Antibody
């Protein structure tokens, strides 16, 4: 079974050069093309490029003069460079085995340029921000955040970088009714998410959100008490 | 010339055990049978589901089939298993490899209106000079829910970001969170902050508002 192992820098500043590497195990680079494909968060797939064991490269014409593909046959690896990186390049980058080389009677070359197997995928984020700890603000329950015997509260994990952060409720004891939303990349380059929880009205009961950010090693235990409205 | 692939529909809402049909049209003819279908589950890499239009890789169950030619191709799931609800892409390799936008197969359930809550910014955040007003749309179906922000009945534009959860495993509903970010000064300059929600489960858009100072 041919296995693919991805690695490379997951953090870049704007205009820098993305560099990713993909090692092939259980098989050789010979006899197939090897492609890099990418997928922005919440969006579709986009074929970046392909390179074979001989060094021949092809790339998406929409990317113009950015793709630089390389092959290390001695290591059975292939690498992708994407210079002049921008915010539109923040994506999960997969490497996969492209089409094999077939030998027929009158023609020989590469066919069936589909992708199998796939790599695990490396998330490359483009941002001018550095490591920064989050600020946890209480989304407090009130008359505006209640519907009958059902109220809602939570926490806002604002301005942190990079991904990710973990949010628990009452040190993991509160799991039902919890919705931890995917983070959004703010215009400031910092991430931000919201973790809400639905509870009964009669309980309004201690609620504490535990936010953990490993890249900054910042842990915040914020108690959410009801406000007024 | 690149071959643009368009899949149909965008989202396919079916029940477990039903038949799923995903169409894939191309702007140009795909030579021979140079088309493949991939399946992707959330948080996972795309898996080769079908190669060569109709051929099936080793391990892929019999319920997945592929047909078509020229510019029209079709992926078919005869009996939708629970593990089949995911995104499906089509890719041509007659010329430069291009993908379709993708088709999401999700659980079909009854229309559920969102429970709309609103959260003012905390005093601790106002001390920092930024006001975040959060609007929560809890447990709704289908996923399509429009959130608009109105500051003193003035429609906002550009200062709002929303995030949606994956389809819940128990009730198959979605939840949405919309953050409206203003400066502390712009927050103190205004009074009424309202979140307007338009959803298929609502006979009219519901507005959850609060007046600054009283909240």
């Amino acid at each position: 079974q041919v296995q693919l192992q991805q690695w490379g820098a997951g953090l870049l500043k704007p205009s820098e050069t993305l560099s990713l590497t993909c090692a092939v195990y259980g098989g050789s680079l010979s006899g197939n093309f090897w492609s890099w494909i990418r997928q922005p968060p919440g969006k579709g797939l986009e074929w970046i490029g392909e390179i074979n064991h001989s060094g021949e490269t092809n790339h998406n014409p929409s990317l113009k003069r950015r793709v630089t593909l390389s092959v290390d046959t001695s290591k059975n690896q292939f690498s992708l460079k994407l210079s002049s990186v921008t915010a539109a390049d923040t994506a999960v980058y997969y490497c996969a085995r492209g089409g094999p080389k077939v030998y027929y009677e009158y023609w020989s070359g590469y066919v069936n340029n589909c992708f199998d197997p796939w790599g695990q995928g490396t998330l490359v984020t483009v941002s001018s921000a550095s490591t920064k700890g989050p600020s946890v603000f209480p989304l407090a329950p009130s008359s505006k955040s209640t519907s009958g015997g059902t109220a809602a509260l939570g926490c806002l994990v604002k301005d942190y970088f990079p991904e990710p952060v973990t949010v628990s409720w009452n040190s993991g004891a509160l799991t039902s009714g919890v919705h931890t939303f995917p983070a959004v990349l703010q215009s400031s380059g910092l991430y931000s998410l919201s973790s809400v929880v639905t509870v009964p009205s009669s309980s309004l009961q201690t609620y504490i959100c535990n936010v953990n950010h490993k890249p900054s090693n910042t842990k915040v235990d914020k108690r959410v008490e009801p406000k007024s409205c | 010339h690149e071959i643009v692939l368009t899949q149909s529909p965008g989202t396919l809402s079916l029940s477990p055990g039903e038949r799923a049909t995903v169409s894939c049209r191309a702007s140009q003819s795909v030579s021979a049978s140079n088309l493949a279908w991939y399946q992707q589950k959330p948080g996972q890499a795309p898996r080769l589901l079908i190669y060569g239009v109709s051929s099936r890789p080793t391990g892929i169950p019999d319920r997945f089939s592929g047909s078509g030619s020229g510019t029209d191709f079709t992926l078919t799931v005869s009996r939708l298993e629970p593990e089949d609800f995911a995104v499906y892409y089509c890719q041509q390799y007659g010329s430069s490899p291009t993908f379709g936008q993708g088709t999401k197969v999700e659980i079909k359930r009854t229309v559920a209106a969102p429970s709309v809550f609103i959260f003012p910014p905390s005093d601790e955040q106002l001390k920092s000079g930024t006001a975040s007003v959060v609007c929560l749309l809890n447990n709704f179906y289908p996923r399509e829910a429009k959130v608009q922000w109105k500051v003193d009945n003035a429609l906002q534009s550009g200062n709002s970001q929303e995030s949606v959860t994956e389809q819940d495993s128990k009730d198959s509903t979605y939840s949405l969170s919309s953050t409206l970010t203003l400066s502390k000064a712009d927050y103190e300059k205004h009074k009424v902050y309202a979140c307007e929600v338009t959803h298929q489960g609502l006979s009219s858009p519901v507005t959850k508002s609060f007046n600054r100072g009283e909240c």
